[PDB]
């Protein structure tokens, strides 16, 4: 028994640590607005012609 006992605790601690880390990562990802992704477009000329 005790070998499994002091393995379950390690697994659970690690699980919660990853849960925290992934919450952090998701919240960091969600702040990137559209303009940031769209700043890299190649040719603005055709776009401006289109919209005008």
């Amino acid at each position: 028994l005790p070998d499994l006992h002091r393995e379950l605790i390690n697994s659970s601690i690690r699980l919660r640590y990853d849960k925290y880390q992934t919450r952090e990562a998701q919240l960091l990802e969600d702040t990137k607005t559209g303009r940031d992704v769209a700043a890299g477009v190649q040719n603005p000329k055709s776009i401006s012609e289109y919209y005008s």
Binding site: A38, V41, Q42, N43, S46, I47, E49, Y50
Partner: protein
Amino acid sequence: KLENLKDKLPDIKSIHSKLLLRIGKLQGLYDSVQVINREVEGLSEGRTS
């Protein structure tokens, strides 16, 4: 889809020009009436024929 818009500029352009032509004709039509009405006034005010 935002990258490649040079290939979709023509069609819209066409419609635009087409619309313009239509307006022109309609405008012309109104101008036409604005002459004939005037001529009819000519017949009413006395005799000028």
